[PDB]
Structure formats: structure tokens, C-alpha cells
């Protein structure tokens, strides 16, 4: 039902894939992955097709990339701080 | 009791009552074995007993009374109350007991600063145990309430747990105020000061975490907590210079974790009707201390002579010329502190290196400067001038050389416009005069000054006695008086200093024969605070400062 | 972090070794100040001994005595980073 409401994290990742990379800041970035996978693995919303599953896969991998990049940045900063 | 010709009866009476409580509770803990009364409570393990917070508060009231009279040099605590602290620690080494122990620490901290004599009955170890108590119950005790508000059943939960946090923050406000008391009064060790300056970042990290996780914004209690820390930091800054840098070394670091939006950055309003971010008052507060001199007297054999316009009879001009030695410790250290900070943050926040300045670290600084503008005009601060002029002496450095990126030359210019658009419309266009008791008040706005500026001398008489009563009992605005004077007397010398005045700078020795009379110390007012800003380089060099735009209209480049 | 923790252990046993400083500090402080600069205005051999071991930790005393709290903070931060990598 991710298209209609904003209950599940499937809606959030759908927004991330559909609109753009922006409009999803760090405070709302920290979402779940396993729930999104177990929501996409079952049958999708009112359009029974695969196109939406492809968009959702693009969204989850984009979120994955952005979270990994943020972790890299924090680890670089932590190295800099311990250097002193 | 109550005596109108004296108080000695009141003093000895209350001292008797207190020593009575002493003996009473002592003989109690001695002779109490299973008696349950209004002073103690027998624990669930009936082997245990501990004071009622009632008796605790009674002791607190007793010391509160004895404070205003100060019988510290008049009491036996040695093996008299040392045992009290022994009982305390005995319990301490291990919700109701938590609040109670908060009452115990509040009271004994009140006990400690009572006595300023040589012994004072504290070996600087139990106090460190109390600091350990506070830090341990500070660093992983408020996150349980964090979890209980953000991960509860989420049903009326926004109005079911926050009041516990509010009353806890009130309690830690009480203990922070008494910590400020002990920090200013007694001398300290160094492990303790490292401990407290390391306490502060935990405050800043957890309240940022709260402001990020839940946008409920009812965080005025966090401001109640944040307010008294900077007082202790200022005291330790002024008093212990051997690690004066070190606190600075972190005070800006926590500046990175700040609210990154306007609706949350605006905080406690000012008197003149403006709202600022309260964290900003830390920076000015440190240089508000800046070790202003306090030995104003006791440097010359004598006060003023009778005829200074012929010879400094009696007093020594070189002894009068010892002030700049001290003022060098003020002046040549103020900018030294001001450049550890301005140069650092402007270095990062100007360039767009790696996803922090261009992301947010150039936004926190751009609101800090605005705060520093609005809080400039007001007399309870006086370092805002010497801080902002350093921003000018960095921006003008940047746009000269071509060794910088294209956007660097854009962004630094915008911060110039914020200053000039406020400083030019600040006073120059509003009054540029006075009419009640003014000087001639019309001259060139350059190094040229007023020959008949003796009128300004008595103008700086009010706001000196006026600034003496307004913080008589309190110390949280102690350094405001000497800075707002010690940075005008030097200008009067600097006016006597300049050049080429055969008897023309001897009327200013007659003005020295008027102001140096205030070496015998103090025996509308808003605008007078402004006029002294027209001796700073900021207001004075404005034409040489607008040079970098008007004579920079045409350019090699186009951006 | 492992090396900073070992330096923390050094500065901690140094907090038992500055305990000698504090003990002779309390000692000298009370005895010489109180007695022979109030009421008028054993103490040398082991005193110079310790005072040369006092030279010794001040040569070790390139101060990073911040070690306790910094170790705690950075240990907790490392834990958080490790957990975030595992979820990734």
C-alpha cells in the first residue's frame, strides 16, 4: 500500500526512488532494509507487475549507497579526531 | 533572633541551633539501632538507616542562614561534620534513593564552600567522588528517559514522561548552581577542572541528540541546564591560565553539533528586544573575562598632583606608564584568543572542501555572526567590538590575493555586507550627536579628536556607579565593570600619547587630573555606551573598509 | 584505540604514581607551609630519591592525562560504528 499512505518504510523508499535522491535527509535516512525486502518479496500493490519492483530495487540500492557513504564520512572524521 | 542594633545574638543563636543538630544527629546514628523517627529511615534490610531528606533540607536551611552571616571561621566540623561526610560517602560508594542522594550532594556542596580557611575539611577526593556520581548519573541515565519517550507505546506518550525529565533538570540545575558557587569561591586542583570541562560536552551531545530525534522542541529546561556552565568556564578561564587554552580547544568543537535551522536556533531573548542563540554568548563571555586587570591601584607612590600641566609632581609618569604592560597582557592576548577561533572556523566554513562547510558548517557560522551583531549594542557585553573587528581583518585578507577559489571570493564578500549594512545604520545615521551634556560632537571621523573632550570625563561617571550596584551580590556579571572602564582609561592615555601637542595634550593631563581622581574609586545611560565605540578601529576605519567594494566595482573577473 | 588504551593504563598507574606526588605534595605542603612559614616566618634522602623518580614521570609526563574519559568516549563510538557496519 506504499503508494497510498506513509505507514511502511516501503513508502519511504518508494519516495526515494520515485522522486529523487533528495527530500530524504539523515534524520529520515535511518530506515530498515530487511522489512523492505520482505515487503517487496511478497505480492505488490494494486498494479500486479514487475516495473514497480524494479523501481523499488533501485531505491533500496540508492539508500544503501548513501548510508554507506555517510558511514565512510563519519569514520574519516573519527580517524581525524583520534589523530590528536 | 532579630536584633535591630546588632545581629550577634542571631549569629550565636543559629550557630547553637546548628551545633545542636550536629550533636543530635551524631548521638542518633550512635544510639539509634532500631528506632524509627522523623530524622532517619530504617531500610528494607532493617540493618540499614538513612536521613530523611527533611532533615537534609533542614541542614541546608541552617547553612543557608549561616551563609549570609558567614560563620565558617566560627564552627567546629573537624571530627564534627567530617563524620557526617563519612556517613554520606558510606552510602554513596554503591528513583527515591537517586533523588535523595541528589539532595545529599546539594547539601554537602553547600557545606563545603562554607569554610574558606586553610583546612576546610576536604582532601579534594570526596568532591571527585561526587563529580563521578554526577557524571555517571548524567551520561547513561537521561537516555533511559529518551528511550521511554521515543520508543514507548506512542499513545499519550508525548504527555506522559517529559515531566520527570523536567524535575530532573531542575535538580541538576540546583547542583550546577552550587557547583558554580564552589568553583568561584575555593581554589581547586586540576583533575577536577578537567573533569568538569569534560562534563560539558556530554550536555551538548545529548541535548543535540534529543533535538534531532524528537521535534517536540519543549527544551527550555535544556537551556536552564546550559546557562550556568559558562559561568564556571569563565571563572576557570580568568583564574587558571595554565590550561586556559585547553577549554578553548574544545569549546568550539561542540559548536559543530548545533541546530541547523532557524526556528530552533533562536533562543532566549535579549533586553533590547532581539532573540539569539544562547550558545553564542559563550564566545564573548570568555573574552569578557580576558583577564581584565583588577589591581587598578597600588602601582604609583601617589594619586593626582595639583598642577599636572607643568610637571607630574609626586606621582611617576613611568609608573602611570606601567598600565600598558598590563594592557599588553590584555590587548596582545585578546586578539591571540580571538584568532584561535575566528581563523579556524572561517578557514573551514569559507572553503567548500568536503560536505560539511557547504552542507552545514557554513550555516552555523553565518547565524553566529548575526547574533554577534544584535548583541553588540548592549552594555552587559563589551567584547563584541574586538571580536567582530577580527572578522574584518580576515575577510579583507582573503579578497586581496588571487590565490583562492572563485566561490571563496564570493562567499567572504557576503559576510562583509552583513557587517557594513548594520554598523553604518547602527549609530552613524541615527544620532551622530548628543544634546544633554555632549561634547562638541562634530569633527572628522578619523584620528582627529576633540580638544574639549574633558566633558566626556564626567559623562563616564554614571554607568560606573550605576554598574556597581546592579551586580553587587552576584558574580555572574563581575567582570563587566572593569572592562568597560579599563578600556576607556587606556584610550585617554592613547589620546595623550599620539603626537605634536605642546600643552594641548596637557589639558588631557588636566583631564588625567580629573579621571585619575577616580583612583579614589566610586564614592539615558544607554547611548553613552555607544559613543565609546567611536574610538575602536571598526567604526573609525569604515571608509578604508568600504574601499574594498567601491574601488572594487570593476574587476578582472565577472563573478 | 588499542594504543591509546595502553597509554591510558600508563597514565592510570601514573595516577597511582602521581599518588606518590600527591602524597609527598600533601606532606610537603602541610608540613613546610603550615609550620615553617606560619609559626616562625628523613626529609632529604628519600626526598631526592623520589624527586628524581619525579623527574622520571615528568619525562613520562608528556601529559595525555585525558586518557580515561577520552578512552570511554571513543570506545563507545567504536562500538556504534562496528554495529552500523554489520547492519550494512
Curated annotation (Swiss-Prot), chain A:
PTM annotation: Hyperphosphorylated during S and G2 phases. Proteolytic cleavage of a fraction of hyperphosphorylated form at the onset of anaphase may be essential for the proper progression of anaphase and sister chromatid separation.
Domain of life according to the entry: Eukaryota
Subcellular location: Nucleus; Chromosome, Centromere
Function description: Cleavable component of the cohesin complex, involved in chromosome cohesion during cell cycle. The cohesin complex is required for the cohesion of sister chromatids after DNA replication. The cohesin complex apparently forms a large proteinaceous ring within which sister chromatids can be trapped. At metaphase-anaphase transition, this protein is cleaved by cut1 and dissociates from chromatin, allowing sister chromatids to segregate. Also involved in the DNA double-strand-break (DSB) repair system.
Assembly notes: Cohesin complexes are composed of the psm1/smc1 and psm3/smc3 heterodimer attached via their hinge domain, rad21/scc1 which link them, and psc3/scc3, which interacts with rad21. Interacts with ssl3.
Family: Belongs to the rad21 family.
Protein name per UniProt: Cohesin subunit rad21
Organism: Schizosaccharomyces pombe (strain 972 / ATCC 24843) (Fission yeast)
Gene that this polypeptide is encoded by: rad21
UniProtKB/Swiss-Prot annotation, chain B:
Location in or out of the cell: Nucleus; Chromosome
Subunit structure: Interacts with ssl3.
Family classification: Belongs to the SCC2/Nipped-B family.
Functional description taken from the UniProt entry: Plays a structural role in chromatin. Chromatid cohesion molecule required for equal sister chromatid separation in anaphase. May form a stable link between chromatids in S phase that is split rather than removed in anaphase. Also required for spindle-kinetochore interaction in early mitosis and inhibit sister chromatid separation until the cleavage of Rad21 in anaphase.
Protein name according to UniProt: Sister chromatid cohesion protein mis4
Recorded name of the encoding gene: mis4
Swiss-Prot record, chain C:
Places the protein is found: Nucleus; Chromosome
Cystine connections: none
Coiled-coil ranges (or none): 63-88
Its job: Involved in chromosome cohesion during cell cycle and in DNA repair. Central component of cohesin complex. The cohesin complex is required for the cohesion of sister chromatids after DNA replication. The cohesin complex apparently forms a large proteinaceous ring within which sister chromatids can be trapped. At anaphase, the complex is cleaved and dissociates from chromatin, allowing sister chromatids to segregate.
Record family assignment: Belongs to the SMC family. SMC3 subfamily.
Record's subunit section: Cohesin complexes are composed of the psm1/smc1 and psm3/smc3 heterodimer attached via their SMC hinge domain, rad21/scc1 which link them, and psc3/scc3, which interacts with rad21. Associates with sor1.
Domain comment as written in the entry: The flexible SMC hinge domain, which separates the large intramolecular coiled coil regions, allows the heterotypic interaction with the corresponding domain of psm1, forming a V-shaped heterodimer. The two heads of the heterodimer are then connected by different ends of the cleavable rad21 protein, forming a ring structure.
Protein name in UniProt: Structural maintenance of chromosomes protein 3
Gene name linked to the record: psm3
Full-sequence portion shown in this chain: 200 to 995 of 1194
Amino acid at each position: 500500500e506504499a503508494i497510498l499512505s506513509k505507514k511502511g518504510p516501503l513508502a519511504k523508499v518508494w519516495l526515494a526512488a520515485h522522486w529523487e535522491k533528495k527530500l530524504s535527509k539523515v534524520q529520515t535516512l535511518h530506515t530498515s532494509i530487511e522489512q523492505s525486502v520482505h515487503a517487496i518479496v511478497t505480492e505488490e500493490t494494486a498494479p500486479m507487475a514487475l516495473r514497480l519492483s524494479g523501481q523499488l530495487m533501485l531505491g533500496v540500492v540508492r539508500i544503501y549507497s548513501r548510508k554507506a557513504r555517510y558511514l565512510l564520512e563519519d569514520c574519516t572524521e573519527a580517524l581525524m579526531r583520534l589523530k590528536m | 533572633p532579630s536584633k535591630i542594633q546588632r545581629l550577634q545574638d542571631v549569629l550565636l543563636k543559629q550557630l547553637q541551633d546548628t551545633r545542636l543538630l550536629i550533636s543530635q544527629v551524631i548521638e542518633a546514628e550512635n544510639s539509634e539501632d532500631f528506632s524509627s523517627n522523623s530524622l532517619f529511615i530504617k531500610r528494607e534490610d532493617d540493618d540499614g538507616k538513612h536521613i530523611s531528606s527533611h532533615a537534609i533540607e533542614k541542614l541546608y536551611m541552617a547553612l543557608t542562614k549561616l551563609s549570609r552571616l558567614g560563620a565558617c571561621d566560627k564552627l567546629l566540623e573537624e571530627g564534627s561534620i567530617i563524620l557526617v561526610k563519612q556517613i554520606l560517602e558510606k552510602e554513596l560508594k554503591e528513583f527515591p534513593n537517586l533523588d535523595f542522594i541528589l539532595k545529599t550532594t546539594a547539601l554537602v556542596l553547600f557545606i563545603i564552600f562554607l569554610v574558606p580557611s586553610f583546612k576546610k575539611l576536604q582532601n579534594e577526593e570526596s568532591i571527585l567522588h561526587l563529580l563521578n556520581i554526577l557524571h555517571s548519573i548524567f551520561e547513561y541515565t537521561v537516555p533511559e528517559a529518551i528511550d521511554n519517550i521515543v520508543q514507548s507505546k506512542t499513545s499519550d506518550a508525548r504527555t506522559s514522561e517529559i515531566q520527570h525529565l523536567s524535575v530532573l533538570l531542575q535538580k541538576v540545575a540546583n547542583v550546577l548552581n552550587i557547583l558554580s558557587k564552589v568553583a568561584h569561591e575555593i581554589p581547586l586542583s586540576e583533575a577536577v577542572v578537567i573533569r568538569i570541562v569534560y562534563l560539558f560536552p556530554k550536555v551538548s551531545t545529548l541535548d543535540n541528540s534529543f533535538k534531532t530525534k524528537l521535534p517536540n522542541c519543549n527544551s527550555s529546561s535544556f537551556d536552564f541546564l546550559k546557562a550556568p556552565l559558562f559561568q564556571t568556564l569563565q571563572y576557570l578561564f580568568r583564574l587558571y591560565p595554565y590550561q586556559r587554552d585547553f577549554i578553548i580547544e574544545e569549546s568550539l568543537t561542540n559548536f559543530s553539533h548545533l541546530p541547523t535551522a532557524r526556528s530552533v536556533s533562536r533562543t532566549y531573548r535579549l533586553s533590547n528586544g532581539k532573540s539569539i542563540q544562547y550558545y553564542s554568548t559563550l564566545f564573548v563571555r570568555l573574552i569578557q573575562s580576558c583577564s581584565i586587570q583588577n589591581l587598578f591601584d597600588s602601582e604609583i607612590v601617589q594619586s593626582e598632583s595639583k598642577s599636572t600641566e607643568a610637571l607630574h609632581s609626586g606621582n611617576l609618569t613611568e609608573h602611570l606608564k606601567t598600565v600598558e604592560s598590563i594592557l599588553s597582557k590584555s590587548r596582545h592576548e585578546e586578539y591571540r584568543i580571538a584568532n584561535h577561533i575566528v581563523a579556524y572556523l572561517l578557514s573551514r566554513s569559507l572553503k567548500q572542501n568536503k560536505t560539511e562547510s557547504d552542507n552545514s558548517f557554513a550555516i552555523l557560522t553565518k547565524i553566529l555572526l548575526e547574533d554577534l551583531l544584535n548583541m553588540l549594542s548592549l552594555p552587559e557585553w563589551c567584547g563584541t567590538e574586538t571580536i567582530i573587528r577580527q572578522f574584518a581583518m580576515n575577510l579583507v585578507m582573503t579578497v586581496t590575493n588571487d590565490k583562492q577559489a572563485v566561490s571563496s571570493k564570493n562567499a567572504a564578500l557576503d559576510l562583509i555586507s552583513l557587517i557594513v549594512n548594520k554598523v553604518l545604520a547602527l549609530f552613524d545615521l541615527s544620532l551622530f550627536e548628543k544634546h544633554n551634556i555632549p561634547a562638541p560632537t562634530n569633527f572628522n571621523d578619523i584620528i582627529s579628536f576633540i580638544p574639549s573632550i574633558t566633558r566626556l570625563n564626567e559623562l563616564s561617571q554614571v554607568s560606573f556607579n550605576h554598574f556597581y550596584f546592579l551586580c553587587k551580590g552576584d558574580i555572574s556579571l563581575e567582570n563587566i565593570l572593569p572592562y568597560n572602564y579599563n578600556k576607556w582609561f587606556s584610550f585617554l592615555l592613547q589620546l595623550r600619547k599620539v603626537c605634536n601637542d605642546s600643552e594641548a595634550l596637557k589639558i588631557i593631563d588636566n583631564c588625567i587630573d580629573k579621571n585619575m581622581q577616580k583612583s579614589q574609586e566610586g564614592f539615558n545611560d544607554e547611548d553613552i555606551f555607544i559613543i565609546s565605540l567611536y574610538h575602536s578601529s571598526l567604526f573609525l576605519n569604515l571608509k578604508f573598509f568600504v574601499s574594498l567594494i567601491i574601488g572594487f566595482l570593476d574587476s578582472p573577473q565577472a563573478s | 584505540l588499542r594504543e591509546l588504551e595502553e597509554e591510558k593504563n600508563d597514565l592510570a598507574v601514573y595516577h597511582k604514581k602521581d599518588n606518590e606526588r600527591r602524597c609527598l605534595e600533601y606532606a610537603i605542603y602541610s608540613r613546610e607551609h603550615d609550620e615553617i612559614n606560619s609559626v616562625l616566618d628523613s626529609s632529604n634522602a628519600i626526598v631526592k630519591k623520589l624527586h628524581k623518580i619525579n623527574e622520571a614521570l615528568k619525562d613520562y609526563g608528556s601529559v595525555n592525562k585525558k586518557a580515561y574519559e577520552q578512552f570511554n568516549n571513543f570506545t563507545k563510538q567504536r562500538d556504534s560504528l562496528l554495529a552500523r557496519r554489520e547492519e550494512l
